[PDB]
Design brief:
Two copies of one chain form a homodimer. Chain A has two domains: 1-157, Alpha/beta knot (3-Layer(aba) Sandwich), CATH 3.40.1280; 158-208, Trp Operon Repressor, Chain A (Orthogonal Bundle). Chain A is 26% helix and 21% strand. Chain A has five helices and nine strands, in the order ββββαβαβαβαββα. In chain A, helix 1 runs parallel beside helix 3. The longest helix of chain A is centred in the C-terminal third of the chain and has 19 residues, at 185-203. Chains A and B meet through strand 3, strand 4, helix 1, strand 5 and helix 2 of A and helix 1, strand 3, strand 4, helix 3 and strand 5 of B. The structure holds S-adenosylmethionine (2 copies). Chain B: Residues 2-213 form the tRNA methyltransferase TRMD/TRM10-type domain.
Chain lengths: 212, 213
């Protein structure tokens, strides 16, 4: 059984989690509005950066109070950031056996670095990037991470995959490769292995230790 | 002016991003995102979108006849067809910049083992097709990948949304839970501040992404 808490200034953005595993009760997902932990009438969560620069930075005081209430020493705190360590399939396998994930979603130019630093004195913290592009907020990264982790959780149960096919065997004058219709398991496995390695050298040569 | 059409068996998944578009951009005709239920193009009373894989094995494959009809209706010769897949070419910031000036994106969201390969192969004989991965992990469906792609592209279109790693950022208060903002940032020596930030970027990249060096 896993608990996932997501903290955000846009809780409505996390509604896509509800095409659930949540229904099966293996995981509980709760979404929290960061503005709940403010105290001023304007409920301000951001301020200009020290040292100059474009944009705004999320204030540490509000985040500190929220994480104080939600986290324990056993929590794995996940902080999405384009400057993070890479989130990969290996990471997903690792987090699939955790009891409690808390995902802190940033906006603007991100969260004051002292929030993560303070948290690390009490719990395990992971700052992670989901890919080499820039999003407007951490909410889409939270949805990606939750999906990748949940399909590996017990109870739900290298190379690029080659192409797949289904009926009919001929469509618009395009045929399913005849080996797949041949019923020869050894020949099919061999062909599928070759397609995978061929697609990998063309699209992701780095996976096989080549340039680019 | 960009049109984005998304085709999916879970249309409600895309509904946050539609509502995140500013009214001013929509009213000015800068952007229009539309979402379509794939089952609209099914042929049978059971609204079937998948079938068993040729050659055997576990899982299911999405049907070519259903997808072919959907893309026939939605795409034109000017369309850039985006097909998310963990076996695709990598989607990067460079890709996002390129797609930000397109007139028409269509995103085909897969499920299960993916879409019968003849769909993309056929489409590529009359339009541009791009099979892309958003990262080195496996998702259950293409919808989350569509959200990522739409966000990364549209924040580069003016008025819609919006090497080395960036270093840490700080704001008020100057002291918090025993931790002070680095004094250099409050110094008013802006050449020195820029050099400090550059070195912070270098250290963070060596630690977290040595591949970038
Ligand atoms: C415009 S980004 C920049 C802020 C970022 N934290 C930084 O320090 O560079 C705003 C937020 O979107 C999220 N984000 C953007 N790109 C991301 C990526 N590639 N991976 C994970 N999260 C990302 C993070 O939550 C981030 O704080
Ligand atoms: C379980 S995946 C595997 C299917 C995939 N098309 C294949 O043949 O390898 C099912 C669907 O989720 C989406 N998906 C999973 N991982 C993805 C990734 N890393 N990047 C983009 N889309 C992904 C794709 O739409 C894919 O068709």
């Amino acid at each position: 059984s896993m608990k996932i808490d997501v903290v955000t200034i846009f809780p409505e953005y996390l509604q896509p989690v509800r095409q659930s595993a949540i229904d099966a009760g293996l995981v509980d997902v709760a979404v929290h509005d960061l503005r709940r932990w403010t105290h001023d009438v304007h409920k301000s969560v951001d301020d200009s950066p020290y040292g100059g620069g474009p944009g705004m930075v999320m204030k540490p005081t509000v985040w500190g109070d929220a994480l104080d209430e939600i986290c324990t020493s056993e929590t794995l705190l996940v902080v999405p950031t384009p400057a993070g360590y890479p989130f990969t399939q290996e990471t997903a396998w690792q987090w699939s056996t955790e009891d409690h994930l808390v995902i802190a979603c940033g906006r603007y130019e991100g969260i004051d670095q002292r929030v993560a630093d303070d948290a690390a004195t009490r719990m395990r913290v992971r700052e992670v990037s989901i890919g080499d592009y820039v999003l407007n907020g951490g909410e889409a990264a939270a949805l990606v991470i939750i999906e990748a982790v949940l399909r590996l959780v017990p109870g739900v149960l290298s190379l690029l995959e080659g192409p797949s096919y289904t009926r009919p065997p001929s469509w618009r004058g395009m045929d399913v490769p005849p080996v797949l219709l041949s019923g020869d398991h050894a020949k099919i496995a061999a062909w599928r292995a070759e397609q995978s390695r061929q697609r990998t050298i063309e699209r992701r040569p780095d996976l096989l230790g080549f340039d680019s």
